[PDB]
Amino acid sequence: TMVKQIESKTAFQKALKAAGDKLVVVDFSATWCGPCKMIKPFFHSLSEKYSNVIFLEVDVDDCQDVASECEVKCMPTFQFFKKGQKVGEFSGANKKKLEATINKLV
């Protein structure tokens, strides 16, 4: 519910600017992706449990260009950002690790 959809390359660069010193979690997923749908409700629920963390969403079908530049091979892929810089990443619909990575990098 506190997740925002990134529908353009500019909205992506903007969100990372507007976050300040907060951690940014990006979910690179697609509408046809099986495991992506399995972990999606969990992602959204974490966003209303972490006021300190910015939760974002990229759709790789619309953003093939963006997905490629971020070296996304499979989905869901979660990438984590402090300031402008990437501070960590992992791939796969893993509920426990997603939470653990948020707790660690916050």
Interface segment toward ligand COM; rule CB under 6 A; list 1-9, 30-38, 43-51, 89-97: 1-9
Minimum gap (Å) between residue 79 Cβ and ligand COM: 6
**Residue 103 φ then ψ, to 5°:** -60, -35
Dist CA 73 CA 78 (whole Å): 12
Residues carrying an active site annotation: 33, 36
Residue number with CB closer to ligand COM (51 or 85): 85
Q: Can you tell me which of 15, 70, 87, 105 binds ligand COM, judged by CB under 6 A?
A: 70
Confirm or reject binding of residue 9 to ligand COM (CB under 6 A). yes
Minimum gap (Å) between residue 4 Cβ and ligand COM: 13
Residues facing 57 on adjacent strands: 5, 27
Judged by CB under 6 A, the chain residues 40 through 69 that form the site for ligand COM are: 62-63, 66, 69
CA end-to-end span of the chain: 20
Question: Which pairing describes strands 53-59 and 23-29: parallel, antiparallel, or unpaired?
Answer: parallel
What angle separates helix 34-47 from helix 95-105, to the nearest 10 degrees? 40
Binding site for ligand COM (CB under 6 A): 7-9, 62-63, 66, 69-70
